[PDB]
Amino acid sequence: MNLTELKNTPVSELITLGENMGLENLARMRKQDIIFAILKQHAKSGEDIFGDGVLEILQDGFGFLRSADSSYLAGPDDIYVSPSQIRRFNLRTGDTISGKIRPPKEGERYFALLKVNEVNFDKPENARNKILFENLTPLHANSRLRMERGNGSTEDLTARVLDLASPIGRGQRGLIVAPPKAGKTMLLQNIAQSIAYNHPDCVLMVLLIDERPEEVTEMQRLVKGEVVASTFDEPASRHVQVAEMVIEKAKRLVEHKKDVIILLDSITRLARAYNTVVPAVLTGGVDANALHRPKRFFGAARNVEEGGSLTIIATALIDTGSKMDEVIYEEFKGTGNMELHLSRKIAEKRVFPAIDYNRSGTRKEELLTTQEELQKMWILRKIIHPMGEIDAMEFLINKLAMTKTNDDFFEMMK
Amino acid sequence: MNLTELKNTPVSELITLGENMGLENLARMRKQDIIFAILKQHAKSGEDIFGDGVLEILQDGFGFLRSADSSYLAGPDDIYVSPSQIRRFNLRTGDTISGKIRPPKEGERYFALLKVNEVNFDKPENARNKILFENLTPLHANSRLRMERGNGSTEDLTARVLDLASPIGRGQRGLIVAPPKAGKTMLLQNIAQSIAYNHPDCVLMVLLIDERPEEVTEMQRLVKGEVVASTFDEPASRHVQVAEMVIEKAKRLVEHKKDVIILLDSITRLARAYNTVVPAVLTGGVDANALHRPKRFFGAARNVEEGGSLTIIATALIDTGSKMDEVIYEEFKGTGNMELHLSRKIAEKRVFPAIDYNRSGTRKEELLTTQEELQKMWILRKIIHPMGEIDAMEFLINKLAMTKTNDDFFEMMK
Amino acid sequence: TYQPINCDDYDNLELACQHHLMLTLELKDQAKASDLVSRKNVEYLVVEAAGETRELRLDKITSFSHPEIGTVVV
Amino acid sequence: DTYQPINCDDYDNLELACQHHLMLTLELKDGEKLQAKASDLVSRKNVEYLVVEAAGETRELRLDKITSFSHPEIGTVVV
């Protein structure tokens, strides 16, 4: 029937679906093997075999279609694309392609594409006249992504503090500096929830590089959007492949005047994987040329004058007792235009947001706010300056716990 | 027709121009490939294509003509120059050549030079006899470059304070010491606007070494001169190549008795790129032999006695948390004849332009000013000496906004 | 107009263009092949019929057989 | 007579004709034309010349007078 519906089915029902079709015990093979067997058996109807995926082009000239539900993992259920079709349709890596596929005739191992229906959710002759991404001109963030919601809750305090400390716009390049066990995953989840509720017209992407399986399951079950991850069991080439696929898909989407947002956890471990993979001078453990590829990633964020935006919010790790992390953090310093610092001292006393107010801030705040809002924010910033860290956080929490919408709190200091 | 007129039009018009010639799909390629294809398709009329460029002689013996619209980046649309022509016209790197070009012959890759028309905006036989830059003698500056415009606006309150604190002459070697977030980018843009309006006979050149992509498009639409830059997502070899081409091209213009000015963004970033490209004493991480090339660039500023001039004003970053930036600033201390300091305390009170007035000054002030002006400035210096930094800045700002010129403020001081 | 053909029908056809192979199609009621290009979003099949360069449209193709290949574009 | 210079295309191929002591047919660019033996080329007071070895005797031929260099490899030229 549909490949997408087949991939989105629990394995228990998938086994009984193939048992009714005369297939023997499929309970001891992997999921993709079951999919391949079911597809190979249901090869009698000349139609009703539909498939879609994201294109990856190998260095030999032929390409494959990959699926995001397995995080673009190569397997037996991929779709083969010939170089002739690539020349025909001006195809490029990162393009989403939908259409019809056909079984392998003989001497082949993969299903092949029969007819192209949509490229990048558009007509094939319309998605070959778009201008490239290093062909557009970048601007500042002359727009704004509001985070705070209206309902009075406890999870809204973090969003309100974030809104008061560092505004966020479309096209930002933000950095979060986090010590160990300071509540960073909760911050990312809160930001994702706020983006999902407030702005349903943008495309949300969450990237995890070197996590643990339980965290992957929790993030997949909590986030409204696309979640792509790789665990620490896999080699580094897998991390590199995932990162490149995600960035190319985002670029192709931006080419169509869309707004894309990416949340990246531990750019540090991406840099470490690139250091592992890149061929071999040394500055304390890292290669000088090993940091070229990650920066390109971080360098993709910009506001497009012709229309569209790409926002990247990345996490950096400090105070882990490793020279590599310190070198990576010192090299990546000063490249972004938004900073957010977390503190261990506030986290030891069990204060929830644990944000360092006096260190945070964004460049070019005058373009994301009105005159009155900027004046009120300056007035608020003047008072907090002499205070300490824990004192400032306790003051902010106590004051913000009374009224809502960050308006009635500004009228309570008349 | 013309290469220069083709590199200046936007890609949107280039695509239409190519389509009006019977070309196939060139909308998903970069600018240079489209330009090359358009050039190759128009090659059906002898003696029609013009060209100009700046020569860069490679170590193998042959050279290339490169353009300033791409920050001298190598591409498929460069112009090849054979060693025989170099021997025939006595050419050097940094020379500007304009003439005719011809299509590539079968087996070759690039367009080639056909006929030389101009060298350094002069006749080829006239530019054959000019004494080399290292055979001239240097002295102190004489002619002054005034910044005050006598308008009466707010942006003039920075030029007036600059004129009061540290006068600038033709041939200066100045250093600006700036802490993070003190309005160092707004100060550089103010100097460029005063030079283009007051002294239009000078050649202005701005150079950025590790800027962000959005900060390059903003400075390119404000400065009335030539802006060259490289982003942070490029290799260390690309930072060194962009700087060598700008200093060699400036020495070639001073041999024709001209006045050139260079505004270098941060000399601290150029020294970091030479430390990653020079073969392995790492004093604080900085190799002892990795500071020789950067001191050769800064030491070219002088006042020729035969005619011509070269002024250079660079920026030195301080208090960033890096031990490498503190070692580089201590090596370039006492090499300039002008110095301007910036205070973070004055920028925290929202007071601009924040020029520490008790630490800045120039050597040999008596040669650049008249006796009466020197006496008035001595009186002002004696008056301001006991005041504090913020107090002196507020006093100067309050007093200077009652007149229109500095002459009316000196007579009102009685 | 110009309904596009299947990728499999455009694959062998493009592979048949290599090594200057011949085809089997003259009237609509032996022929040398040359190449296949596209213009104004319309692909054509240039054939060298004894010097005559006929532009056969892929949208208006009756059939296509051979002594080694045989296939009926749908 | 100010000696209008020749192109960068002919020069390069005429600089290769000097190498390996080839035999061409340059002579004059009136009517005179028969053999010679280009050996080298030099400049003097903003004027270029072509030193040959025609039957021992060496003359100075200007590059602003040569009309062709017929030689098996490099033959055709108008300048």
Numbering used by the authors:
A (entry chain C), B (entry chain D): 1 to 280, 284 to 417
C (entry chain c): 4 to 32, 37 to 81
D (entry chain d): 3 to 81
Please share text taken word for word from the publication where this structure appeared:
Rho plays an indispensable function in transcriptional termination and gene regulation in bacteria. Rof (Rho-off, also called YaeO) is the only E. coli host factor that directly interacts with Rho and inhibits the Rho-dependent transcription termination.
The assembled complex was further validated in gel filtration assay, and the results confirmed the extensive interactions between Rof and Rho. We subjected the assembled complex to single-particle reconstruction cryo-EM study and determined a 2.8 Å resolution structure of the Rho-Rof complex. The overall structure shows a Rho hexamer (open-ring state, comprising six protomers A-F) interacting with six Rof proteins in each of its protomers. The architecture of Rho is identical to previously reported open-ring state Rho structures, in which the midpoints of protomers A and F at either end of the ring are offset by 45 Å and leaves a 12 Å wide gap. Rof binds extensively to Rho by attaching its N-terminal α-helix to the N-terminal of Rho. The negative-charged residues Asn9, Asp11, Asp14 from Rof N-terminal α-helix form hydrogen bonds and salt bridges with Lys115, Lys105, Ser82, Gln85, Ser84 in Rho, respectively. In addition, residues Cys10 and Tyr13 stabilize the interface via van der Waals interactions with residues Leu114, Phe 89. As showed in Fig. 1d, the residues Arg46, Lys47, Asn48, and Glu50 from β3-β4 loops make contacts with both protomer D and C by forming strong hydrogen bonds with residues Gly22, Glu19, Glu125, and Arg88, respectively. It appears that the open-ring gap between protomer F and A is causing a disruption in the interactions between Rof’s β3-β4 loops and Rho. As a result, the density of Rof in protomer F is considerably worse and has lower local resolution compared to the other protomers of Rho.
